[PDB]
């Protein structure tokens, strides 16, 4: 019901790459909540742009002096410079960075310079004069399951791509499950790109030494449940939930009903890597995420997710009504 408005009226939506690529500015401020960080988004951006991105964390005088020197160099010669956790050194954000940005409001005379800043939305206040000059981007997770798996798949021998596809589905499903704090997992947890990357590395390492197609699916399940993702888990109930999801996904069946929608057959060893990638992409793109995916795809009670979803809708609609009255 909420997404109805956005889908019906609005026909476009931008990402980080869209904002950076299409902007007259060259100073960018990224913000997120605790345990969420988009530094890897910036490194992927810089690699895709063939740009040299230097990352400097702030919080000490040594790094600060080095940062001042490197800011001067990156503005005279060019290059991308990232300053992490600027809120840690507000006495310098409000004194040095404040004055310098206005100076570069003035020069606008070098094309290969871009500065990036990260901060926490739950932290201290940044000065408005600096905040209202730079571009601002909020980084957060993709809300949809199919969207998340689609993005992960788009970021990326038939067994390698097949296992990567399964891992992408697994990551999307577990990340979606983390939203239901009182119903999905007992405790709130966060999962990020590093867990996905380690799972991919382990899957590739396993595939490297099992040429017979006798894939040790039990070892894959135990490692992913226990080490890659279970390491963060400090509760037996939540680890059992993770084990259930691993058993569902990495079962090794000939045709997995990974959701009530798409069924994923196993690859044929006679096919090419490009052929299997095309087949998997077609399988992914041809389906539809249902309205009640929070229940059916996560196998949760509907009445449990009802309170969650309805209360979010309540807050959104109440705010909209209050704003519209004024």
Size of the site for other proteins (CB under 8 A): 37
* CB-based contact 170:314 (threshold 8 Å): no
Under the criterion CB under 8 A, does residue 84 sit at the interface with other proteins? yes
Report, in this order, helix, strand and coil percent for the chain, each rounded to 5.
55, 10, 35
Q: 241 in helix, strand or coil?
A: helix
Site string for other proteins, 33-52 (x = CB under 8 A): -xxxx-x-------------
Under the criterion CB under 8 A, does residue 219 sit at the interface with other proteins? yes
- Nearer to other proteins by Cβ, of 16 and 88: the residue is 88
What CA–CA distances, in Å, run from 13 to 6, 18, 38, 106, 253?
10, 9, 19, 31, 38
Under the criterion CB under 8 A, does residue 16 sit at the interface with other proteins? no
Please classify residue 154 by burial: count the beta carbons closer than 10 Å to its beta carbon, then call 0-12 exposed, 13-18 middle and 19+ buried: exposed
Nearest approach, Cβ of residue 8 and other proteins (Å): 36
Select from 2, 21, 218, 313 the one that contacts other proteins (CB under 8 A): 218
Instruction: Tell me which residues in 191-210 interact with other proteins (CB under 8 A).
Output: 192, 194, 198, 201-202, 205-206, 209
- Nearer to other proteins by Cβ, of 34 and 310: the residue is 34
Under the criterion CB under 8 A, does residue 325 sit at the interface with other proteins? no
**Sign of the torsion formed by the C-alpha atoms of 203, 205, 210 and 211:** positive
What CA–CA distances, in Å, run from 207 to 5, 18, 25, 213, 251?
46, 37, 46, 8, 16
Chain residues in the site for other proteins (CB under 8 A): 34-37, 39, 55-60, 62-63, 84-85, 88, 118, 192, 194, 198, 201-202, 205-206, 209, 216, 218-219, 222-223, 226-228, 231-234
């Amino acid at each position: 019901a909420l997404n109805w408005f956005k889908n019906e009226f609005f026909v476009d939506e931008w990402n980080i790459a869209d904002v950076v690529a299409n902007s007259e500015n060259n100073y960018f401020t990224m913000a997120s909540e605790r345990d969420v960080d988009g530094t890897f988004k910036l490194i992927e951006l810089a690699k895709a742009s063939k740009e040299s991105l230097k990352i400097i964390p702030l919080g000490s005088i040594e790094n600060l002096n080095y940062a001042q020197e490197e800011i001067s160099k990156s503005k005279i010669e060019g290059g991308w410079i990232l300053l992490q956790n600027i809120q840690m050194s507000l006495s310098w954000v409000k004194t040095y960075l404040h004055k310098h940005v206005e100076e570069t409001k003035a020069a606008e005379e070098h094309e290969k310079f871009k500065m990036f800043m990260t901060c926490h939305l739950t932290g201290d206040k940044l000065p408005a004069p600096l905040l209202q000059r730079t571009d601002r981007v909020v980084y957060e997770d993709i809300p949809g399951i199919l969207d998340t798996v689609k993005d992960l798949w788009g970021s990326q021998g038939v067994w390698s791509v097949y296992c990567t596809f399964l891992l992408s589905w697994f990551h999307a499903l577990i990340t979606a499950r983390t939203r239901l704090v009182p119903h999905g997992f007992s405790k709130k947890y966060y999962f990020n790109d590093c867990d996905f990357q380690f799972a991919s590395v382990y899957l590739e390492n396993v595939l490297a030494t099992n040429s017979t197609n006798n894939i040790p699916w039990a070892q894959v399940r135990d490692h992913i449940a226990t080490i890659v993702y279970g390491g963060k888990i400090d509760e037996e109930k939540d680890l059992e939930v993770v084990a259930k999801l691993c058993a569902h996904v990495f079962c090794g069946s000939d045709n997995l009903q990974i959701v009530p929608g798409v069924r994923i057959p196993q690859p044929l060893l006679q096919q090419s890597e490009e052929e299997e990638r095309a087949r998997l992409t077609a399988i992914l793109s041809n389906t539809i995420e249902p309205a009640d995916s929070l229940s059916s795809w996560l196998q949760l009670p509907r009445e449990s997710i009802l309170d969650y979803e309805r209360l979010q809708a309540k807050e959104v609609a109440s705010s909209t009504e209050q704003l519209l009255q004024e």
